Design a protein around this ligand. Structure first.
Ligand SMILES: N[C@@H](CCC(=O)N[C@@H](CS)C(=O)NCC(=O)O)C(=O)O
Ligand SMILES: N[C@@H](CCC(=O)N[C@@H](CS)C(=O)NCC(=O)O)C(=O)O
Lengths: 219, 220
């Protein structure tokens, strides 16, 4: 059977996989898991992922969870070149470091900001969580010593970072005066023909969704 | 020359790498970076890692940052076999999933709790902070369908998870009634001959260090 991705386009790590699929020329059949209606908490999905998160990949019965693991798996198995995820231990390590930076810092602090508005119905953002996001921006800025997060070549680490950054920057302002490297890096990824369709809209929408929910939770 | 690790024994991701080295029979020449005195904010270290975090590996001139990347690098580079990090894409994926669960959920929420006490002079642990850690316990509990976090075999994903869990559980209590899988899993890792030296001491000490700092901060 087909390669299936259990996903939601609003979700940043889901968009990270979609970008990877596009960059690989892979065809992923998408099946929508509506987080908002609690589809991910249903027993049929929990069976696939006990952590009940998306994205989840179904590769002919073989279940793979977590976006970064999925991306690594996809490049390893279906990549016809290792540009997106090098075989060389040193270069691969630099990608892995950036990938874990994304999950450990960028994404984690993004959801530490979003879920209080999204899940707990609050209409504010505590400044300590704001600053934590701001510092993640700074850390990302410092990491971009080359054209891309994991070096001079675009890798899956860029897909993971841009999917999160394009979502959180719509809620916590990412100043161009303080983070010019990030904006230049965003502009490189925007030159990807499939960027806007896959991530552009989704990221802007999630960011707008949070802001919309924030205002709505205030009425 | 041997491998150089810019490290601190109290640090969970540092101990995860040290666990990996011991499992690989590698000798790590440690260079201590005291975060409390801001050694990691020094220009010479920032050059090594612009994110100014530990651990950082120096393999004969080659710099590798971030514990999980380092752990993968060590097994790939010096592993006599791949049991700690499989070459097989599927089993490898299960490990990677666990690794990113640790940094994305386990460690992140621990840092969300610890950092403000250790560095920002705070003395309280808000209940939403506690809640979120508790929720990480449940997620780990539900992930342990096998004896180890990424399957029947012990992998570097267990090293990453235990180093964080053994630190956070001393602060935010892990109740045995709700998490029997975690406790059994912890007992398995404690059977490793190098566990207490490499992680069992450091993990307990960090949790104790947080509580001590929390007490001292509260006393103005
Ligand atoms: N590190 C994981 C995080 C995935 C994740 O947290 N997804 C969110 C959507 S952005 C989710 O499924 N939330 C539902 C839940 O945690 O219960 C990955 O990249 O796959
Ligand atoms: N995902 C990273 C996290 C590393 C990390 O956050 N280390 C802490 C010590 S527990 C640190 O260096 N903090 C200093 C800082 O962030 O400025 C890894 O596992 O290497």
């Amino acid at each position: 059977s087909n390669l299936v991705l259990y996903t939601l386009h609003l979700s940043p790590p889901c968009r990270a996989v979609e970008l990877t699929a596009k960059a690989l020329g892979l065809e992923l059949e998408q099946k929508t898991i509506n987080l908002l209606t609690g589809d991910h908490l249903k027993p049929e999905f929990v069976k696939l992922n006990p952590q009940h998160t998306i994205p989840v990949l179904d590769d002919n019965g073989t279940i793979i969870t977590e976006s970064h693991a999925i991306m690594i798996y996809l490049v390893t198995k279906y990549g016809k070149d290792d540009s997106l995820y090098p075989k060389d231990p040193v270069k691969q390590a630099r990608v892995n470091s950036a990938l874990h930076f994304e999950s450990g810092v960028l994404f984690a602090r993004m959801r530490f900001t979003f879920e209080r508005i999204l899940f707990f119905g609050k209409s504010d953002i505590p400044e300590d969580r704001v600053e934590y996001v701001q510092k993640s921006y700074e850390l990302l800025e410092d990491t971009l010593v080359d054209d891309f997060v994991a070096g001079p070549t675009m890798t899956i680490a860029d897909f993971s970072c841009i999917s999160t950054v394009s979502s959180i920057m719509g809620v916590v302002p990412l100043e161009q005066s303080k983070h010019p490297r990030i904006y230049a890096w965003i502009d490189r990824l925007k030159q990807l023909p499939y960027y806007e369709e896959v991530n552009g809209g989704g990221g802007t929408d999630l960011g707008k969704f949070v802001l919309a929910k924030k205002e709505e939770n205030a009425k």
